Amino acid sequence: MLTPGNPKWERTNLTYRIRNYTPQLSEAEVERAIKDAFELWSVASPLIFTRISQGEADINIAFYQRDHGDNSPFDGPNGILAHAFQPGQGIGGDAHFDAEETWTNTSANYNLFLVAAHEFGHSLGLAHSSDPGALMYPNYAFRETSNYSLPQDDIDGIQAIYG
């Protein structure tokens, strides 16, 4: 099955909610980084992401520090930047970002957009990739460019799951 053990969403129209923010960026910047991160995946699959302001969305997005209720604590500045749960009900699909990081919209360490795009890959059922140029590669490194789009390896990945 190509990616045994990695769940997938049964529906293509998913909702998401940004539960809180980070002092490092303006609220609009956080919202846009998230929107664009989702767009990277939507343009290469049938996935459609819709934002809600309250209630239970399919994908919860939040900034938390150290222990935050899911037995997968963050580690303070640097190191682990965020993590996301594979597709499923409840915590499934949720993405958490380390609130102790300096979040940016530049090449400066920990560009929210890039981190979120990577995490959403996980929220959608993708595992890490060995392709060093892939968005889902295990190590973060911001590579500035003109137009941002999903590397072909990541397109192969999402297509393999959702078409």
Ligand SMILES: Nc1c(N2CCc3ccc(CNC(=O)c4nc5sc6c(c5c(=O)[nH]4)CCS(=O)(=O)C6)cc3C2)c(=O)c1=O
């Ligand atoms: N591993 C772990 C973490 N991360 C989450 C954040 C994160 C983000 C990204 C990567 C690997 N990818 C990159 O660093 C990266 N990918 C791409 S694809 C792409 C680009 C990039 C890129 O700049 N960096 C930029 C030009 S583009 O035309 O838009 C296409 C790895 C990780 C590893 C943790 O936290 C943790 O534990």
Ligand SMILES: [Ca+2]
């Ligand atoms: Ca969820």
Ligand SMILES: [Ca+2]
């Ligand atoms: Ca950290």
Ligand SMILES: [Zn+2]
């Ligand atoms: Zn968490």
Ligand SMILES: [Zn+2]
């Ligand atoms: Zn990852």
